[PDB]
């Protein structure tokens, strides 16, 4: 008798719901699992979705389960995660096109004249396939496989098929490895499988056979597909030193965009530190040989992802956070000093015999003398760069023209003002800190104006914009560009406490 939803609609929903728009700082995992197509990234909002897509036995489900269950000092949760594939070895071409629960065994009555068209190197067609029985989807998959094998094409002469159950896709696989391209097209035959099957209909993922590649190239391609993440990671087996060094160098090529977190043992720190001196943006974590891995390397990523940047008082310390699930690695002063000199991170135990205290101790991060070392500064710079870029693009897209005069620079200041207000309320800027003589000289050297150090001591930042002319490499013509300089006082967090008391 007509429905409530036509006049009144309440969505409800449990608390702690925070709609957000902007750059997301979430974990990205590069895996060697076969299920993930090479060219696609997937985002999940819950551990249950990951469980349904991958299954309990998978390492990825364990990683996601550990990752999601985490609470910061201000109650918050990562609320997102992303996945991507790294092909370790050469692969055959393949296709996949189903996501929706189309499979309810509707193959009955579809036996007559199966004319699915497979667009390989040369156009070829399939013959009639019996599906009236429709006993089981694996059976009909084997039937289709046999009918494909009936063809004489080199790629289809040894092709295979596979059907997964928890997720619902149908997959083809080519014969040779590392070369070849396949395609599938629908036809005018009314009873064709391709329309009913996942492939050849709307969003269908296709794969081109191609050889093995270095991990850095894989992560570069993944970024080229999308870059809405932070603090990526390699799962599975540990990588050797050379590959890690290459990835660290590639990450350092980008200027403060992501964090490279790796896992390693105590005996291995002597090698890596010499190799990866400088190369900012890389985190080293100590792993226990005896016990299970417990995924220690994810801790900075979880801490970063839990951070909210719009609300005030956002900057947080990395020195004191407790992970009950994880294990304990170091318990002595000597080993702690050696690890600190090696610039490593770990979970150190302060005691037994009572309630235990352990926490992810060093918030330091390997890098050169010029770049920031602490993690919180790195995260704040990431957020600041993102916000500045977004503001500038908004200006360019909204105003009709930006004259190369004082009005243009006034407009630029006007646009950048809200971002600086948000930053100073957030906590990435600090005020009142004392400035050393060498620091004052450095500031005056960087920007030609003197007395700017007073500005950065009082307000915490100093900005200036000028415009000039240049010529680009692609075309001999010349254009006009704007240059700004930004100097600000870095944020800090408490690590060590000094005290003293006198009786009188």
């Amino acid at each position: 008798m007509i429905s409530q939803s036509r006049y009144i609609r309440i969505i409800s929903g449990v608390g702690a719901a925070a709609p957000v728009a902007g750059r997301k700082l979430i974990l990205r995992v590069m895996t060697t699992n076969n299920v993930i197509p090479p060219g696609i990234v997937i985002e999940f909002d819950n551990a249950n979705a990951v469980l349904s897509y991958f299954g309990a036995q998978s390492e990825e489900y364990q990683r996601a389960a550990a990752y999601f269950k985490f609470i910061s000092k201000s109650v918050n949760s990562p609320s997102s995660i992303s996945f991507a594939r790294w092909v370790n070895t050469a692969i055959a071409p393949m296709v996949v096109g189903d996501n929706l629960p189309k499979t309810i065994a509707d193959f009955a009555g579809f036996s007559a004249g199966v004319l699915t068209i497979m667009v390989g190197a040369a156009e070829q067609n399939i013959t009639a396939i019996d599906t009236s029985a429709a006993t089981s989807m694996d059976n009909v998959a084997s039937i289709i496989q046999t009918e494909i094998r009936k063809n004489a094409d080199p790629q289809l002469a040894q092709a295979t098929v596979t059907w997964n159950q928890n997720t619902n896709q149908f997959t083809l696989v080519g014969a040779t490895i590392g070369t070849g391209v396949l395609a599938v097209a629908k036809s005018a035959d009314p009873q064709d499988m391709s329309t009913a099957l996942g492939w050849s209909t709307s969003n269908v993922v296709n794969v081109a056979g191609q050889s093995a590649d270095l991990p850095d190239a894989a992560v570069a391609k993944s970024t080229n597909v999308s870059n809405n993440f932070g603090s990526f990671l390699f799962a599975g087996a540990p990588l050797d030193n050379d590959q890690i060094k290459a990835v660290s160098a590639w990450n350092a090529a980008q200027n403060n965009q992501f964090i490279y977190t790796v896992a390693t043992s105590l005996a291995n720190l002597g090698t890596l530190f010499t190799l990866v001196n400088g190369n900012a943006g890389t985190a080293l974590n100590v792993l226990s040989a005896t016990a299970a891995n417990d995924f220690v390397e994810q801790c900075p990523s979880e801490i970063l992802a839990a951070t909210n940047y719009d609300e005030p008082g956002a900057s947080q310390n990395y020195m004191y956070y407790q992970f009950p699930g994880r294990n304990i690695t170091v318990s002595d002063d000597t080993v702690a000093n050696t690890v600190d000199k090696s610039r490593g991170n770990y979970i150190g135990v302060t005691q037994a015999n009572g309630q235990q205290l352990a926490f992810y101790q060093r918030g330091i991060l390997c890098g050169g003398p010029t770049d920031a070392v602490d993690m919180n500064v790195y995260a704040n710079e990431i957020w600041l760069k993102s916000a500045i870029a977004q503001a500038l693009l908004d200006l360019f897209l909204n105003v009709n023209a930006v004259p190369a005069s004082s009005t243009g620079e006034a407009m630029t200041l006007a646009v950048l003002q809200p971002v600086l207000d948000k930053a100073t309320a957030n906590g990435t800027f600090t005020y009142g800190k004392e400035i050393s003589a060498v620091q004052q000289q450095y500031i005056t050297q960087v920007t030609g104006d003197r007395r700017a150090w007073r500005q950065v001591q009082t307000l915490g930042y100093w900005i200036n914009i000028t415009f000039s002319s240049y010529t680009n490499s692609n075309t001999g013509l010349t254009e006009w560009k704007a240059n700004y300089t930004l100097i600000y006082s870095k944020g800090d967090a408490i690590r060590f406490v000094e005290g003293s008391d006198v009786m009188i």
Binding site: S406, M411, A414, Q417
Partner: protein, 152 residues
């Protein structure tokens, strides 16, 4: 020889809601002072019972007056700002709804920015003087953030 001329000064006003992109002022009235302000008074003092002196901080606003030629486009824009109603504009409160930011440039290159404030008072209709002219309209702002930009 120090050049204190005010020729070529430009001012840009941007508003949170009414004028999200902002406009510029270039036509400044002739008979009235184009821009002026009251003196900042951020410190106080009181005399002690002994005879000494004590000094302390104090809250202090900033007021700015701007005058333009009647009938210009800038007059229309500031009239829109004045007529905008604060009670409306459903928006997140506590941040001074419809915050307005002003940026002013000096001929040398000096730039100053002021935020956390809104227009306060101004005229409603034009005024005729005995000479037959129209008096230059004047508007008054107020700001809270004394952003110390005096770059060269």
């Amino acid at each position: 020889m120090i050049n204190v001329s005010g020729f070529g000064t430009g001012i840009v006003i941007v508003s949170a809601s009414s004028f999200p992109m902002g406009f510029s002022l270039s036509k400044f009235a002739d008979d009235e002072s184009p821009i002026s302000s009251k003196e900042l008074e951020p410190f106080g003092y009181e005399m002690l019972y002994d005879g000494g002196l004590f000094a302390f901080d104090k809250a202090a606003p900033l007021e700015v007056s701007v005058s333009v030629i009647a009938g210009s486009e800038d007059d229309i824009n500031l009239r829109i700002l004045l007529n905008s109603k604060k009670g409306s504009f459903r928006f997140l409160p506590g941040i001074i709804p419809d915050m307005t930011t002003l940026v002013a440039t000096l001929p040398d290159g000096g730039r100053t920015v002021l935020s956390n404030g809104t227009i306060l008072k101004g005229p409603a209709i034009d005024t005729i003087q005995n000479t037959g002219r129209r008096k230059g309209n004047t508007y008054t702002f107020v700001f809270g953030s004394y952003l110390g930009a005096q770059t060269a």
